[PDB]
Amino acid sequence: GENVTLGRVALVRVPNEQGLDKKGGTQWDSTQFSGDKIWGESNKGSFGT
Amino acid sequence: TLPDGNIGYTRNGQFTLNGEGTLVTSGSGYPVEPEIVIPEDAISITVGTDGEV
């Protein structure tokens, strides 16, 4: 009966998503034209849920 | 805004953002006059009929 939070998922939102470079397997990486990775929580500020 | 400094005029409307959030064209990336910088706290973008972003 020990309910303990193990963490929370990280959500990343880049200013220019169109500029993300396409890796394989539906994965993207940050580049010069995509801006810097903005690390934030979910449901906070401009992030989603 | 052209790289040399002059202003170019276009009819194509496919725009996007660069790493700093300024509204640029989806081709060579020329910034749109006047500069429209989308803040990182925005959850949606709306452009009015009168051009008020």
Report which of B36, B1, B2, B34 is spatially closest to residue B16, judged by C-alpha positions: B36
Token code pair at residue A10: 């990280």
The type of residue at B48 is: G
Residue B12 CA to residue B38 CA, distance in Å, equals 20
Please count the other Cβ atoms lying within 10 Å of the Cβ belonging to residue A40.
15
Q: Containing H/E element for A28? A: strand A28-29
Q: Which tokens go with B53?
A: 């972003």
Chain A positions touching B45 (Cβ under 8 A) are: none
Residues B30 and B2: beta-carbon distance below 8 Å = yes
- C-alpha–C-alpha distance, residues B50 and B45, integer Å: 15
C-beta of residue A34 within 8 angstroms of C-beta of residue B17: no
Report the DSSP pairing between strands B23-25 and B15-17.
antiparallel
B26 touches chain A (CB under 8 A): yes
